[PDB]
Design an enzyme around this catalytic site. Sequence first.
Site, PDB file in Angstrom:
ATOM      1  N   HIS B  41       0.812  -1.216   0.000  1.00  0.00           N
ATOM      2  CA  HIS B  41       0.000   0.000   0.000  1.00  0.00           C
ATOM      3  C   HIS B  41       0.846   1.267   0.000  1.00  0.00           C
ATOM      4  O   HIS B  41       0.283   2.362  -0.111  1.00  0.00           O
ATOM      5  CB  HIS B  41      -1.037   0.027   1.159  1.00  0.00           C
ATOM      6  CG  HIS B  41      -0.487   0.098   2.562  1.00  0.00           C
ATOM      7  ND1 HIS B  41       0.245   1.162   3.036  1.00  0.00           N
ATOM      8  CD2 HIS B  41      -0.683  -0.723   3.625  1.00  0.00           C
ATOM      9  CE1 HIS B  41       0.528   0.968   4.316  1.00  0.00           C
ATOM     10  NE2 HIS B  41      -0.012  -0.178   4.693  1.00  0.00           N
ATOM     11  N   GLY B 143       2.858   5.906  10.376  1.00  0.00           N
ATOM     12  CA  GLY B 143       4.188   5.689   9.846  1.00  0.00           C
ATOM     13  C   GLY B 143       4.862   4.424  10.317  1.00  0.00           C
ATOM     14  O   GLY B 143       6.001   4.160   9.920  1.00  0.00           O
ATOM     15  N   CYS B 145       3.874   1.422   9.570  1.00  0.00           N
ATOM     16  CA  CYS B 145       3.703   0.346   8.606  1.00  0.00           C
ATOM     17  C   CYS B 145       5.050  -0.164   8.115  1.00  0.00           C
ATOM     18  O   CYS B 145       5.980   0.611   7.885  1.00  0.00           O
ATOM     19  CB  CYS B 145       2.871   0.825   7.424  1.00  0.00           C
ATOM     20  SG  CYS B 145       1.315   1.549   7.904  1.00  0.00           S
TER      21      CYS B 145
HETATM   22  C1  LIG Z   1      -3.897   2.974   2.326  1.00  0.00           C
HETATM   23  C2  LIG Z   1      -4.399   2.215   3.560  1.00  0.00           C
HETATM   24  C3  LIG Z   1      -4.192   0.716   3.314  1.00  0.00           C
HETATM   25  C4  LIG Z   1      -5.899   2.476   3.706  1.00  0.00           C
HETATM   26  C5  LIG Z   1      -3.655   2.696   4.813  1.00  0.00           C
HETATM   27  C6  LIG Z   1      -3.613   4.045   5.144  1.00  0.00           C
HETATM   28  C7  LIG Z   1      -2.953   4.507   6.267  1.00  0.00           C
HETATM   29  C8  LIG Z   1      -2.294   3.608   7.123  1.00  0.00           C
HETATM   30  N1  LIG Z   1      -1.560   4.047   8.263  1.00  0.00           N
HETATM   31  C9  LIG Z   1      -0.321   4.659   8.285  1.00  0.00           C
HETATM   32  O1  LIG Z   1       0.145   5.096   9.334  1.00  0.00           O
HETATM   33  C10 LIG Z   1       0.456   4.810   7.054  1.00  0.00           C
HETATM   34  C11 LIG Z   1       0.291   4.428   5.753  1.00  0.00           C
HETATM   35  N2  LIG Z   1       1.403   4.849   5.075  1.00  0.00           N
HETATM   36  C12 LIG Z   1       2.203   5.460   5.958  1.00  0.00           C
HETATM   37  N3  LIG Z   1       1.681   5.460   7.165  1.00  0.00           N
HETATM   38  C13 LIG Z   1      -2.308   4.173   9.497  1.00  0.00           C
HETATM   39  C14 LIG Z   1      -3.764   3.503   9.395  1.00  0.00           C
HETATM   40  O2  LIG Z   1      -3.873   2.270   9.322  1.00  0.00           O
HETATM   41  N4  LIG Z   1      -4.856   4.279   9.430  1.00  0.00           N
HETATM   42  C15 LIG Z   1      -6.208   3.752   9.224  1.00  0.00           C
HETATM   43  C16 LIG Z   1      -7.257   4.781   9.613  1.00  0.00           C
HETATM   44  C17 LIG Z   1      -8.668   4.239   9.387  1.00  0.00           C
HETATM   45  C18 LIG Z   1      -8.865   3.802   7.948  1.00  0.00           C
HETATM   46  C19 LIG Z   1      -7.822   2.776   7.554  1.00  0.00           C
HETATM   47  C20 LIG Z   1      -6.406   3.307   7.784  1.00  0.00           C
HETATM   48  C21 LIG Z   1      -1.780   3.595  10.808  1.00  0.00           C
HETATM   49  C22 LIG Z   1      -1.949   4.239  12.034  1.00  0.00           C
HETATM   50  C23 LIG Z   1      -1.436   3.692  13.189  1.00  0.00           C
HETATM   51  C24 LIG Z   1      -0.788   2.486  13.103  1.00  0.00           C
HETATM   52  N5  LIG Z   1      -0.639   1.813  11.954  1.00  0.00           N
HETATM   53  C25 LIG Z   1      -1.143   2.368  10.837  1.00  0.00           C
HETATM   54  C26 LIG Z   1      -2.347   2.246   6.806  1.00  0.00           C
HETATM   55  C27 LIG Z   1      -3.012   1.816   5.675  1.00  0.00           C
END
Ligand SMILES: CC(C)(C)c1ccc(N(C(=O)c2c[nH]cn2)[C@@H](C(=O)NC2CCCCC2)c2cccnc2)cc1
Lengths: 305, 306
Positions: B41, B143, B145
Amino acid sequence: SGFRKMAFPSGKVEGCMVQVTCGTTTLNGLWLDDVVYCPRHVICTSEDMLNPNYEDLLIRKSNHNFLVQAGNVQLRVIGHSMQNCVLKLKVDTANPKTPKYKFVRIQPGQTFSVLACYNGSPSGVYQCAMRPNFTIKGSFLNGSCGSVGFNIDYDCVSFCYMHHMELPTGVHAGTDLEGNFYGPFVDRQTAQAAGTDTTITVNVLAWLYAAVINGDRWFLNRFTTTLNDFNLVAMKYNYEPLTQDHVDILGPLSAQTGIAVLDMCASLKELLQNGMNGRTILGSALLEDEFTPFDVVRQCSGVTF
Amino acid sequence: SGFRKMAFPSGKVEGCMVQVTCGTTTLNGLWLDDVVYCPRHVICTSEDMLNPNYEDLLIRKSNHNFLVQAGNVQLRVIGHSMQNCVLKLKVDTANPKTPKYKFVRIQPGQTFSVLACYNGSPSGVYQCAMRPNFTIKGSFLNGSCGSVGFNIDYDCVSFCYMHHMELPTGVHAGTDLEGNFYGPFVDRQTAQAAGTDTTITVNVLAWLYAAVINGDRWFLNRFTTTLNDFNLVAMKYNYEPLTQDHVDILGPLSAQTGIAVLDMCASLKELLQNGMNGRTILGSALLEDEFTPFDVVRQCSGVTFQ
Ligand SMILES: CC(C)(C)c1ccc(N(C(=O)c2c[nH]cn2)[C@@H](C(=O)NC2CCCCC2)c2cccnc2)cc1
Ligand SMILES: [Cl-]
Ligand code: NA
Ligand code: NA
């Protein structure tokens, strides 16, 4: 989100662990530049440990009484001396993995990471606090002496603990890296005991702030208190007195969450007086006191090294 | 003595963490030999969160659309491919710090260490378990991930988890290092939610054996139980079923302590009924379920404090 007991990454310290042998005793040492540090009781026989004269036992010893093993390599010992309860062995090779480091003596209530080692080999890492009674609630088996505790700031490792002994209640005692004991303990087989312990109030408050940041709010109420009134409750429940300095340190968390420290103190006061009513806080049924305010801000902000 | 949540020393994994950037997105990657592994992703934009087609997004990328940073060194990407939900970036330099390693897919109840990282830099290490509902109860900020979970039994790093996302209840979902998710989760902004979780019964029993090894017996009783009666009771407290495989796995701890597995099951049934009456077990006022039988044998003395 989430909240976990978290240790510092241990790589910079793993590269400093060695095995030190004197006679039939093997334990761990810390190899920094061209010196290995370990507990001075490595020079003692079981007989010696009942009433050791360390001055005399060491003058008896010479460089060739010590074997130092770094992985599979023998380090040649070319000098020896003692600083307080720490033996210092000069070796012929500087550790090329020596990190930027300092020796730091910590205060009760402060936390640190422990790299538990056996035969010079790192085995596990965990987080713990220096208790008010100057013990630590470690996890250590025979052979763990010389394992160290540390914190990290950017690239600089601050070594604060070297493990020396287990007390009869199963808690642990040790020194700073200059060989000064934490607490009223000595490196001899004699009757010794942990004193009665107290709970680290400023850390409990920090963890309540962590719980609020993570969505656990059930213990909040409309009330506030004063230091004087709260500290009468603290004494009742064997909590450390809360000082104005503690209040100042928690200031950031108070501003972020909207709960003044004396506001949160009013919650803690009620939790001490009434219990938790079957509820948990951050997955615990006990009030947790081994997270500092710094630990909470670090974990809730993602600081890296 | 003592008993702690104990992670593996993280150094062997620290030497593999890098930063991966694609467009405006930065996250962590794992650099082993000449390949960097990261969540696919990383190639998603803000309008791709709901229904991304990763094949279509990836075919539009060149090697030089990926920036990989190892400390201060830029690594040159010379190829890329997608395997399930993981992106594999071939780089022109093999990681000189690559440890002995393998990739393993774990079952629910298994534990592992997590090295939480941001911008390719390690922040902290902690212990986790794969929950029965295929989530982990991690500590992860934006961040994180691409942070990984691992074990290091016998000088070989077994990588078992890569972090991908956070679910609505604040727990975490990810993949094995072949990019196959744990559970029914998908790498899409979807209304997906963790199922009702349950307690890992075999781990609670392991931890009770740890308490006996370390010298405490107060929770034992004079009773035993059949396996089926135990499961009928335990499931009323949302405990996972205990299988004969689990009974067999507990054999060595049973042998070291002299407490038959079904006799320890009877103790657990009574603890669920009664609570702890103000006491603790290994410092906890709740029954702990993120230590496995193997973990207990790893950490505890081989000699019971009788
Ligand atoms: C594109 C996709 C698959 C929907 C996505 C988007 C953002 C991230 N998250 C990144 O932090 C992130 C992504 N790229 C850099 N950082 C964060 C995340 O899951 N928020 C979620 C909020 C609700 C909807 C789904 C995503 C995250 C936060 C804390 C700990 N873990 C992860 C993960 C996945
Ligand atoms: Cl498994
Ligand atoms: Na030095
Ligand atoms: Na209040």
